[PDB]
């Protein structure tokens, strides 16, 4: 993902 510390 494009948030922060969440991967994909």
Known sequence: TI???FGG
């Open 3 to 5: 948030i922060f510390g």
